[PDB]
């Protein structure tokens, strides 16, 4: 049987590109579509997906801008640096951010052509189980078709603004808009309790904006709540206001500002409203109902098995668009790559979704991998789980007199205190967590932490002498200081 | 106020005096220099108590004897014996203590 | 047989205190001496040892001061922060540093009395194999004696200024002096190629001082030279001059400055000369010849076996003062604690000195654990060692347009590429290395790194997709960017 | 100079022209704006060559066709065919190339 291509993938994000490059290195003729449908506010960007354009990358860059601000304001004087007229320029930051994103667009493109993947900037959809019909440049004037031996859907997600709130869609921005915003954000309401919400709140506030967060959930659902609270608390100390249990019910434009009326009937004027209440699968324009592919609402996500197969044998899904897969770039990339090998290199690897490490870039950072305390109690029983922990002061911070940090390990008593949960709150969380994540995959036990020599002075060494347990009921507060 | 600078001098003032309150402070301690001016105010106000400061680094032996573990620490001595101990730089907390014995 | 104390230790540094506190928790009557002999410049400090007073602690604090400076000067403008009249105050920094050191003095003291260890601020020495004679406050007016069932020497080291260089001892400062220096350092010559030398040069330069390093041969002996070079190079780019293969031969005071004449007959005016060419065992005043205890020169260090025994059965040595033991605080602490248990709790633990992690706080940081490339070739043969590596750009740095970073793994082909060397150059090295060090102790293999999911974006994730090898001869340069 | 802005226009100038040198540059690229004024100077000096700039982000299809992977890239086209390719912002390197075909 003959096909135009061996592999045709819809999505030039991390999952799609990885899967495509990898399939081409094992002989396949690959074609990849990436087109960017405009945001609620009509924003668009180049090749690469969510991560490079409107996710991890510009997120991390603005975090650094804000973390920088905190250093000038909180720590610089104590350390002997003096200056005047400290101010921040929103436009300048955006150009630096966008300019570096544009460079990544280019390298990602040249990366595709080197790997021998044909790239088409076209809006794509399913005709039948081996045929994709694309619209070149997204124009509906000229439709084309192409066939493939295997089709991968990796269309990712987009931020969801709710239907049943008046003026939201028309007035608010999302993460697709914030990293390229042409105006100063000004006084800002952020709606949502996800890390995106917390991270954006964080940097806008560090930057010097009056920032409010509206939550009718709990901060960081599914993360360890002790850490989640410590992070929230720290953000409150830094100036971000939280309206707990209240959300906007109406939004009205008036005099280039937004009047927001909340569920509690109170109302408030803002300069910008950023919705960050969750993302949904970008499948609507893919014509999946026609092949009767089973999907889930309200994820709006494709149901795929452990081998990334949909209920259509020639069609596959990796990454954000697939139900129950962690929404991290490295996860989409590895799943993509593994699928590409099972298909075109006769591999029998299976994507492993356990012990995935992650890290949140809030004004105090939090890295984690494995089970939270609560979820460990739930699944193994409280009396079979030991929790080691310690609150402590970061050395560089504690000398300023502006606990900052928490080191927490979650262990299985019946498997010799093998570590199944790692959680760390404090500076450079992503850098600390990576090696630890690896240790958890090697089935590390608590005594292994004890016999490892620590690096002094670092926040990470706290995990190497951790002895207070939750069930000892002893204090794990930060000592000192003075005291 | 008046700052004690030896072990002999210290027990002397707890001996030949009936009510005495002591401020245990450190030169490198933030909150012990902060509550320090407010301490000077009760010196004059409540003359039914002799106010003294002890540097913790300097009179090492006294600091070992009163069980000083955090600054600022306040200890009330009546008839030569410690009866109360307050840990903290709260101006409000200190006012509630000196009033308990003087006013 | 009756003794005054079960355990008498000489040294209130990390090793001595740890060994004392630990022995007291297993029943022992412990007495500990710590007295601080003044520096070449007559500098002294409180309880705790080298680490807290004139080492890791004030080092890390000043590093933070200088790293802060680099951020203002190199990155802040690109990120939108504007300010005027940026300057640094040496006096202010020293008070912040010293004030936090003084707080640690206090907590260390109260820590000793809580553990039930008797502390005497006294200069101590050996009378005989169970007797120590001390001088209270270091006065020679009143000598006392005390006996002990076991004696621990943990007297550490002191910086060594050379005898055969005119005016060195009389004119130069050392690490014992720099963290409390009353004057501005001004134009500074640093002599030495150790991490102390590199670290001090680093921060003085970040702080804004004209800094020269006299180096003989190569920097960071013992470390991976690829990383050592990358670090040097980066320091050169930031402004520190290196005089390679030349050292001072004479130093002369004149007009409150120091004229230095080098081996190459050239000469130069400096404000401050800091010697950092190595430390020596502080044993001279201990009267060890009298018990015929074997020591080594030119370490001036006590020879101790793997159980920390000297050739005198009642006498032991841990930490810096002991030959061939890594000069890191956590190393002294663990050895101390293990000795305390073998002695007073019948333990048969043995201090493990393999895979000790470390981290250098140079203006670009470098963390390492395990073998360098070269030493692996030497001990296993080049053809049996694979080296994976990758130069890359830190995300936050590469957006400034001011390779920054290197990730390097060293593996044994004949043990399934088990990782025996980890080396990382880039920001937050100490935080990255800790979890990795642990992984090396779990006998991690290169494929384990490959199956661990990465945390994006972080410098540490570079180790999770490392595929160029030295023997592939392929490029491992940083891509981009532009390009 | 003159900046090409489509695929049609691009192959047109490599067709109906004998000697043509092209500057592949990016707006976000440091070294491509840096060697950019010096490029304007050879425009007038060596009229035995038609000088053109192509933005790499803008004419995506040309950039895929000439194998542009780094900026600034310089490609010499003689009789409609690429013959030389220089990668770099060295003013010296560019002078050696334009002299190879024009002067
Ligand atoms: C604000 C924010 C911050 C984040 N931060 C992090 C972080 O710090 N670390 C981390 O690991 N993860 C982060 N993420 C998550 C991460 O970006 C995603 O998991 C990652 O993008 C993987 O998604 P993907 O590869 O499956 O597809 P996506 O990256 O979402 O991209 C899919 C591509 O498909 C395209 N597309 C859709 N339909 C079509 C069509 N019909 N034709 C052509 N093209 C189409 C899209 O335009 C898009 O380019 C963040 C996300 C957000 C929103
Ligand atoms: C500038 C610098 C930076 C450093 N940075 C780091 C770092 O970032 N990380 C790290 O892990 N390590 C660092 N170190 C090393 C670390 O300080 C040592 O490894 C550690 O202090 C060793 O502890 P110790 O108990 O063996 O000896 P010491 O800490 O030196 O303690 C010895 C104490 O005993 C006293 N003494 C000597 N003789 C007598 C006597 N006869 N009677 C009474 N007292 C006596 C001394 O005053 C001294 O305080 C650094 C060192 C320096 C110099």
PDB file of C-alpha atoms and ligand atoms in Angstrom, chain A residues 454-457, chain C residues 10-16 33-37 45-46 48-57 59 122-125 154-158 175-176 179 195-196 199-200 279 282 285-286 318-321 326-330 332 359 361, ligand 2:
ATOM      1  CA  UNK A 454      26.007  17.315  51.788  1.00  0.00           C
ATOM      2  CA  UNK A 455      27.201  20.310  49.829  1.00  0.00           C
ATOM      3  CA  UNK A 456      27.669  23.244  52.208  1.00  0.00           C
ATOM      4  CA  UNK A 457      26.274  25.757  52.203  1.00  0.00           C
TER       5      UNK A 457
ATOM      6  CA  UNK C  10      40.642  19.744  70.879  1.00  0.00           C
ATOM      7  CA  UNK C  11      38.907  21.910  68.267  1.00  0.00           C
ATOM      8  CA  UNK C  12      35.569  23.671  68.228  1.00  0.00           C
ATOM      9  CA  UNK C  13      35.304  23.387  64.458  1.00  0.00           C
ATOM     10  CA  UNK C  14      32.738  21.296  62.510  1.00  0.00           C
ATOM     11  CA  UNK C  15      34.539  18.006  63.125  1.00  0.00           C
ATOM     12  CA  UNK C  16      35.206  18.600  66.799  1.00  0.00           C
ATOM     13  CA  UNK C  33      38.320  23.095  73.867  1.00  0.00           C
ATOM     14  CA  UNK C  34      38.209  25.825  71.289  1.00  0.00           C
ATOM     15  CA  UNK C  35      40.606  28.745  71.245  1.00  0.00           C
ATOM     16  CA  UNK C  36      41.433  30.872  68.184  1.00  0.00           C
ATOM     17  CA  UNK C  37      45.126  31.734  67.657  1.00  0.00           C
ATOM     18  CA  UNK C  45      36.895  35.255  65.944  1.00  0.00           C
ATOM     19  CA  UNK C  46      34.358  33.310  67.988  1.00  0.00           C
ATOM     20  CA  UNK C  48      32.708  27.352  65.405  1.00  0.00           C
ATOM     21  CA  UNK C  49      35.841  26.845  63.386  1.00  0.00           C
ATOM     22  CA  UNK C  50      36.989  27.836  59.936  1.00  0.00           C
ATOM     23  CA  UNK C  51      33.677  27.290  58.073  1.00  0.00           C
ATOM     24  CA  UNK C  52      31.486  29.666  60.073  1.00  0.00           C
ATOM     25  CA  UNK C  53      33.966  32.421  60.792  1.00  0.00           C
ATOM     26  CA  UNK C  54      36.472  32.603  57.937  1.00  0.00           C
ATOM     27  CA  UNK C  55      35.227  30.064  55.363  1.00  0.00           C
ATOM     28  CA  UNK C  56      32.055  28.722  53.675  1.00  0.00           C
ATOM     29  CA  UNK C  57      29.675  31.056  55.412  1.00  0.00           C
ATOM     30  CA  UNK C  59      32.492  33.268  51.462  1.00  0.00           C
ATOM     31  CA  UNK C 122      41.276  27.435  76.137  1.00  0.00           C
ATOM     32  CA  UNK C 123      44.453  26.751  74.196  1.00  0.00           C
ATOM     33  CA  UNK C 124      45.095  23.037  74.621  1.00  0.00           C
ATOM     34  CA  UNK C 125      47.884  20.503  74.189  1.00  0.00           C
ATOM     35  CA  UNK C 154      40.380  18.297  65.309  1.00  0.00           C
ATOM     36  CA  UNK C 155      42.443  21.464  65.185  1.00  0.00           C
ATOM     37  CA  UNK C 156      41.940  22.024  61.469  1.00  0.00           C
ATOM     38  CA  UNK C 157      44.252  24.127  59.305  1.00  0.00           C
ATOM     39  CA  UNK C 158      45.469  27.659  58.771  1.00  0.00           C
ATOM     40  CA  UNK C 175      41.239  34.250  54.038  1.00  0.00           C
ATOM     41  CA  UNK C 176      41.373  34.657  57.864  1.00  0.00           C
ATOM     42  CA  UNK C 179      35.936  38.634  55.553  1.00  0.00           C
ATOM     43  CA  UNK C 195      39.109  27.604  44.777  1.00  0.00           C
ATOM     44  CA  UNK C 196      39.674  29.966  47.721  1.00  0.00           C
ATOM     45  CA  UNK C 199      36.433  32.571  44.785  1.00  0.00           C
ATOM     46  CA  UNK C 200      37.963  35.606  46.476  1.00  0.00           C
ATOM     47  CA  UNK C 279      46.529  25.625  54.164  1.00  0.00           C
ATOM     48  CA  UNK C 282      47.508  23.396  62.900  1.00  0.00           C
ATOM     49  CA  UNK C 285      51.539  23.853  69.551  1.00  0.00           C
ATOM     50  CA  UNK C 286      50.028  20.438  70.331  1.00  0.00           C
ATOM     51  CA  UNK C 318      39.187  13.932  62.193  1.00  0.00           C
ATOM     52  CA  UNK C 319      38.669  16.679  59.681  1.00  0.00           C
ATOM     53  CA  UNK C 320      41.136  19.127  58.190  1.00  0.00           C
ATOM     54  CA  UNK C 321      44.012  18.255  60.484  1.00  0.00           C
ATOM     55  CA  UNK C 326      38.767  16.266  51.937  1.00  0.00           C
ATOM     56  CA  UNK C 327      38.720  19.704  53.484  1.00  0.00           C
ATOM     57  CA  UNK C 328      34.942  20.162  53.504  1.00  0.00           C
ATOM     58  CA  UNK C 329      32.802  20.845  56.606  1.00  0.00           C
ATOM     59  CA  UNK C 330      30.213  18.148  55.916  1.00  0.00           C
ATOM     60  CA  UNK C 332      34.498  16.602  59.033  1.00  0.00           C
ATOM     61  CA  UNK C 359      30.905  23.126  44.590  1.00  0.00           C
ATOM     62  CA  UNK C 361      31.516  29.695  44.035  1.00  0.00           C
TER      63      UNK C 361
HETATM   64  C1  LIG E   2      37.875  30.568  52.717  1.00  0.00           C
HETATM   65  C2  LIG E   2      37.329  29.194  52.940  1.00  0.00           C
HETATM   66  C3  LIG E   2      36.121  28.827  52.368  1.00  0.00           C
HETATM   67  C4  LIG E   2      35.608  27.544  52.577  1.00  0.00           C
HETATM   68  N1  LIG E   2      34.428  27.222  52.023  1.00  0.00           N
HETATM   69  C5  LIG E   2      33.908  25.995  52.211  1.00  0.00           C
HETATM   70  C6  LIG E   2      32.685  25.641  51.634  1.00  0.00           C
HETATM   71  O1  LIG E   2      32.000  26.575  50.877  1.00  0.00           O
HETATM   72  N2  LIG E   2      32.158  24.424  51.820  1.00  0.00           N
HETATM   73  C7  LIG E   2      32.815  23.539  52.564  1.00  0.00           C
HETATM   74  O2  LIG E   2      32.266  22.274  52.747  1.00  0.00           O
HETATM   75  N3  LIG E   2      33.990  23.831  53.133  1.00  0.00           N
HETATM   76  C8  LIG E   2      34.570  25.052  52.984  1.00  0.00           C
HETATM   77  N4  LIG E   2      35.768  25.363  53.554  1.00  0.00           N
HETATM   78  C9  LIG E   2      36.434  24.328  54.367  1.00  0.00           C
HETATM   79  C10 LIG E   2      35.967  24.148  55.809  1.00  0.00           C
HETATM   80  O3  LIG E   2      35.975  25.369  56.519  1.00  0.00           O
HETATM   81  C11 LIG E   2      36.781  23.084  56.533  1.00  0.00           C
HETATM   82  O4  LIG E   2      36.765  21.949  55.763  1.00  0.00           O
HETATM   83  C12 LIG E   2      36.247  22.776  57.906  1.00  0.00           C
HETATM   84  O5  LIG E   2      36.287  23.931  58.668  1.00  0.00           O
HETATM   85  C13 LIG E   2      37.016  21.746  58.670  1.00  0.00           C
HETATM   86  O6  LIG E   2      36.553  21.552  59.966  1.00  0.00           O
HETATM   87  P1  LIG E   2      37.487  21.022  61.107  1.00  0.00           P
HETATM   88  O7  LIG E   2      36.663  20.605  62.297  1.00  0.00           O
HETATM   89  O8  LIG E   2      38.169  19.761  60.594  1.00  0.00           O
HETATM   90  O9  LIG E   2      38.569  22.160  61.417  1.00  0.00           O
HETATM   91  P2  LIG E   2      38.311  23.690  61.724  1.00  0.00           P
HETATM   92  O10 LIG E   2      36.987  24.121  61.164  1.00  0.00           O
HETATM   93  O11 LIG E   2      39.422  24.533  61.156  1.00  0.00           O
HETATM   94  O12 LIG E   2      38.273  23.913  63.286  1.00  0.00           O
HETATM   95  C14 LIG E   2      39.391  23.986  64.095  1.00  0.00           C
HETATM   96  C15 LIG E   2      39.252  24.861  65.279  1.00  0.00           C
HETATM   97  O13 LIG E   2      40.113  24.455  66.284  1.00  0.00           O
HETATM   98  C16 LIG E   2      40.838  25.563  66.758  1.00  0.00           C
HETATM   99  N5  LIG E   2      42.147  25.083  67.292  1.00  0.00           N
HETATM  100  C17 LIG E   2      43.285  24.710  66.683  1.00  0.00           C
HETATM  101  N6  LIG E   2      44.156  24.300  67.618  1.00  0.00           N
HETATM  102  C18 LIG E   2      43.562  24.396  68.833  1.00  0.00           C
HETATM  103  C19 LIG E   2      43.948  24.127  70.166  1.00  0.00           C
HETATM  104  N7  LIG E   2      45.236  23.619  70.422  1.00  0.00           N
HETATM  105  N8  LIG E   2      43.110  24.325  71.206  1.00  0.00           N
HETATM  106  C20 LIG E   2      41.882  24.805  70.964  1.00  0.00           C
HETATM  107  N9  LIG E   2      41.462  25.080  69.714  1.00  0.00           N
HETATM  108  C21 LIG E   2      42.271  24.884  68.633  1.00  0.00           C
HETATM  109  C22 LIG E   2      40.759  26.575  65.638  1.00  0.00           C
HETATM  110  O14 LIG E   2      40.610  27.875  66.164  1.00  0.00           O
HETATM  111  C23 LIG E   2      39.643  26.216  64.900  1.00  0.00           C
HETATM  112  O15 LIG E   2      38.483  27.054  65.099  1.00  0.00           O
HETATM  113  C24 LIG E   2      36.294  26.610  53.353  1.00  0.00           C
HETATM  114  C25 LIG E   2      37.505  26.993  53.919  1.00  0.00           C
HETATM  115  C26 LIG E   2      38.019  28.264  53.715  1.00  0.00           C
HETATM  116  C27 LIG E   2      39.328  28.563  54.354  1.00  0.00           C
END
